[PDB]
Design a protein around this ligand. Sequence first.
Ligand code: CLA
Ligand code: CLA
Ligand code: CLA
Ligand SMILES: CC1=C(/C=C/C(C)=C/C=C/C(C)=C/C=C/C=C(C)/C=C/C=C(C)/C=C/C2=C(C)CCCC2(C)C)C(C)(C)CCC1
Ligand code: SF4
Lengths: 257, 185, 74, 89, 162, 86, 70
Amino acid sequence: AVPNTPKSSPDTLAGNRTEASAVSRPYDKFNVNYPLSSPDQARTEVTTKEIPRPEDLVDSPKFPLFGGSANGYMSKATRERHAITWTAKEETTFEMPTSGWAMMNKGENLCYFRKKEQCIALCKQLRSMKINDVKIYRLSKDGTVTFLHPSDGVFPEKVNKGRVPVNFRPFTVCQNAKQGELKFTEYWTKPYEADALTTLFVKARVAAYNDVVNLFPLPNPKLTSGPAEPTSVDYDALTKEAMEGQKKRIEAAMASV
Amino acid sequence: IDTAPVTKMKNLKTGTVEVDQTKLSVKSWGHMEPCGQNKKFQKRIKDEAFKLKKRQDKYAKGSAAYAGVQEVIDQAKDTAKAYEGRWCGKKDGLPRVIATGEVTRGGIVTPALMFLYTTGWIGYAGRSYLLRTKDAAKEIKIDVPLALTCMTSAFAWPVYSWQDITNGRFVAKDTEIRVQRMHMA
Amino acid sequence: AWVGPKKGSQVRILRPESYWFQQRGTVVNVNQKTNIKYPVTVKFDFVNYANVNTNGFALWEVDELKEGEYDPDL
Amino acid sequence: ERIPGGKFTKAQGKIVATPDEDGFTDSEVALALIIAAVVLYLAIEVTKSLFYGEDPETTAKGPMTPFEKRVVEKGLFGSRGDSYSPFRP
Amino acid sequence: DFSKAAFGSATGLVAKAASQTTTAIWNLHADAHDFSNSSYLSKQVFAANLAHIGVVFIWLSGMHFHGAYFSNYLDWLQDPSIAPTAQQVSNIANQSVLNPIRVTSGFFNLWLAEGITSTYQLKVIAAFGLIASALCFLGSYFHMHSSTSFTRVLNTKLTSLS
Amino acid sequence: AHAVKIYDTCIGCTLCVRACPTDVIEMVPATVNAAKQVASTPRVEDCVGCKRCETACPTDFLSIRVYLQENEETQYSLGLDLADWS
Amino acid sequence: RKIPAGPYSVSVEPLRDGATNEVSIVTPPISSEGVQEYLSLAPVFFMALAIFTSGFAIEVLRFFPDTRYW
Ligand code: CLA
Ligand code: CLA
Ligand code: CLA
Ligand SMILES: CC1=C(/C=C/C(C)=C/C=C/C(C)=C/C=C/C=C(C)/C=C/C=C(C)/C=C/C2=C(C)CCCC2(C)C)C(C)(C)CCC1
Ligand code: SF4
């Protein structure tokens, strides 16, 4: 129907949603292994044949007993879909994440949602009702299906092998470098993204700055085109005595620890 | 066509600032006089008495309301007689509070001492209770005998507090309390 | 051998960001495994803003206190 | 003619005396508009310069003036620092 | 036993270290009448309603008492155009200016609509209001502590209630 | 994409995993805590920023930290339901 | 207590045989220790302290109106 839904296809209404997201939001990108944490993690692949896009399913037997609601996704206005594929033991009622109530099928079940949060909420509800094998998929504009939630087959609540730690920082939260210490670096506004080596280095650097009794003057550059100023201080002798001071200070510090 | 009242400054080019010692007292100030002979204060008292009498006239003689307003009138008369010793300006007639530190009629030193003693009593009673009841149970559930013991025993707060301050039992060492060092000082 | 504070002994927290920093807590148990970074489990009378009063600390973040060398009045 | 509002306008009796002529004629207004047009052109140039920022080659390919060389060498006029501070000394 | 349980909320507040915060006190106040789902929820609700009825009866008794003793109700009967005042104000501090407070609750007109002409009738109504409040408090106690569960009144006995 | 980090103080509660409404946190094996498991966030792109994971972390301070990045909002981070940017 | 009755109930179990001549006192089983403990609550104790202080101030204002002795 033309008054119920726009007459044009979702792709026509989308226009250039792609090639503009890459311009409007160049930061918005997925890592090389989105559902997983390591490249060598099986990476089970599914296609549209297994989980088809919702516009290709009409009165599917795997749909639950749902009467439709205004709270579902935006057909023809959005193209991304998230699907849940869970198998029931009996036909019971459950709350849809978009409000309203549906009744599960005896066997296979399949629901479609826009946001992954709705799918995860439904998965939490189903697992609270003693349901395993709740698989959550993502449907893209072109129909590519990405398998999510139990990405490596084991639910994230349970530790499983082959899962490399991601975004793990080997220190306490307040052991991050301060923004002033990371100034003029790529991590100035994001000190939580700095390396452990970088954070330790800058935290030692700030301490080094606060020891002007042994800090080095770092002589001025020679920018003027004229001859070098004779001055009255020998930089070579200062450098040698600073080498001696650094050696003795390091020796004493290592003796302390 | 005129401006605000122009005030006259002291063109003090002499190089010295003279503070008159005889002017360091309320009785020597030319802008405040005792309420007894302040014409504006007397007019205020007369207006108050007239308003009270007018309010009284509404109720018939001998009624309870008449007696109430009569007691109000007597209270106002006694208050006026007491306030005649206060200091009240020269154009307002409202008695003033002298916070210089001179012990005068309507001063601040005696009220300050009384309040400070009373509230040091309150604070020391609370602190003593918290020190002798180091327990949230006894905080939500007041130990009434111990609470009243502390309350009536805090009368010696000014001297006990100073003894604890000088003996180190009052303040806490900064290295033994929860102090904000999240910046890793 | 046992490493770390003794069980049930009061310790002062040296972790600057901890809710009980420089305060005092009772050691529940110390994990006698060298790979554990924060073995010292300390219980406090005060709960933090998360309404939890038990936390694990590193060996260098707790100062064991003798039976009478601390202040009983916190 | 105005309807006076406010106690002080009535009390002080200040009158808004309109000048008989205009004051700037029309030719001088045109000259002001021309100068403002030149200022607008300069403002467009400044906006284009600031929006696209400073290109990386300038201040890197253009050698510093001897004044700038000596100032950076000796650390003067806000150099040897990371601040602007127009009221430096 | 019952007196021990009267401060049972405070005892539970101090029992756990997690509830030894002022936030626990504010929660104790906020969750005061939030009667949790249980076998005695309907008893609790009905007893609370009856206690509130007793409170309102206390209020009505106080209003009739003020009409009887601290009001110019008889003078208003003799002349309705006068200001209805039913709250005397004692001479403390300096508040004597507002001693007759013109009450605007309409109790004088209500009592005249009820045929009340003597302050003795207002005294009797205040006394009977106190008696009714006492009876409501007794009934609320009884229902909270010794009566039927009342769980059938909204689903099963809704026809009888309505 | 709101960056979410895990620190050494994590003790393998799995509460942060159960509190995530978008399956961001994930339990990896590790040899730093007695639980021999540590949270990880390999799907930060799904993090809305609700900080439910921080509400469920029992450590003295948050072993899992959600750093909101308002200059890098995403339809997954903004929780868009009626607008698609893919 | 098979019949669902609230906690702290002075009600006899409604599952009784033929009419019983029994004593079932409907009065709260309160305790003097419990009553004293309740009146020692921080809300009760501090509201009583506030009432006492307010009344003391009231009486001082009544018998010594205004600050006549300033
Ligand atoms: C044992 C009780 C006690 C004691 C000794 C203190 C002592 C202090 N408080 Mg304090 N306070 C208290 C209770 C107490 N407070 C309570 C209950 C509150 C919550 C309202 C506060 C809120 C508070 C704030 C917001 C501030 C202080 C500040 C201060 C300091 C300056 C004095 C001041 O401004 O007081 C003023 C006191 C108040 C404004 C609140 C008083 C409320 C009542 C009167 C106190 C309770 C007394 C206690 C119940 C007695 C019971 C005894 C009985 C159990 C035996 C001082 C260390 C200030 C500070 O840090 O300065 C350095 C400050 O900014 N307090
Ligand atoms: C028949 C009337 C009635 C009844 C029986 C209830 C009953 C209930 N309401 Mg409710 N409510 C009502 C009317 C009513 N409400 C109305 C008219 C509103 C709109 C204003 C609300 C708004 C409301 C909210 C928003 C909430 C409730 C909640 C609740 C539950 C817990 C209440 C509680 O613990 O409060 C304890 C008692 C108090 C907090 C009273 C404190 C005093 C109040 C806050 C201000 C009074 C100021 C006073 C008038 C002025 C002082 C005098 C001045 C001169 C100083 C309970 C089932 C809460 C709940 O979770 O329900 C499950 C909840 O969150 N109600
Ligand atoms: C000590 C203070 C005090 C007390 C105890 C009372 C007590 C009473 N007044 Mg009263 N009154 C007072 C001060 C007081 N009043 C003041 C200062 C005025 C202004 C002149 C009035 C004006 C007034 C009128 C006009 C009437 C009463 C009535 C009543 C009776 C009804 C019970 C009641 O108030 O319901 C309890 C209600 C509340 C506690 C408040 C309900 C919410 C209010 C209406 C909203 C506004 C709150 C507040 C007024 C605004 C300021 C609050 C805060 C900012 C300070 C009762 C005896 C009525 C009556 O029939 O008397 C026999 C009546 O008609 N009073
Ligand atoms: C009549 C005439 C004419 C014409 C005229 C005209 C038309 C004129 C115009 C004029 C104009 C039209 C003017 C305008 C102006 C404007 C301006 C002048 C502006 C400015 C601004 C500024 C200056 C600022 C800027 C900025 C900003 C805001 C941001 C960025 C940065 C900057 C700072 C740059 C002609 C020639 C024909 C003839 C003669 C006369
Ligand atoms: S809740 Fe905190 S401590 Fe527990 S596993 Fe998650 S991040 Fe680690």
